[PDB]
Amino acid sequence: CGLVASNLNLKPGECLRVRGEVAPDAKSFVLNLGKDSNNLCLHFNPRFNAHGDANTIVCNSKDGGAWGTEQREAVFPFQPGSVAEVCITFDQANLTVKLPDGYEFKFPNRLNLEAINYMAADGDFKIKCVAFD
Q: How many CA atoms lie within 13 A of 129 on its CB side?
A: 9
Site mask, its own copies, residues 99-128, x = CB under 8 A? ----------------------------xx
Cα–Cα distance, 129 to 115 (Å, whole number): 21
Nearest one of 117, 112, 113, 97 to 45, comparing CA atoms: 97
* Of 16, 20, 28, 39, the one binding ligand JB9 by CB under 6 A: 28
Our CB check for its own copies shows the closer of 17 and 27 to be 17
Our CB check for ligand JB9 shows the closer of 14 and 122 to be 122
Our CB check for ligand JB9 shows the closer of 5 and 102 to be 5
Exposed/middle/buried for residue 21 (C-beta within 10 Å: 0-12, 13-18, 19+): middle
The answer to whether 23 contacts ligand JB9 (rule: CB under 6 A) is yes
The answer to whether 8 contacts its own copies (rule: CB under 8 A) is yes
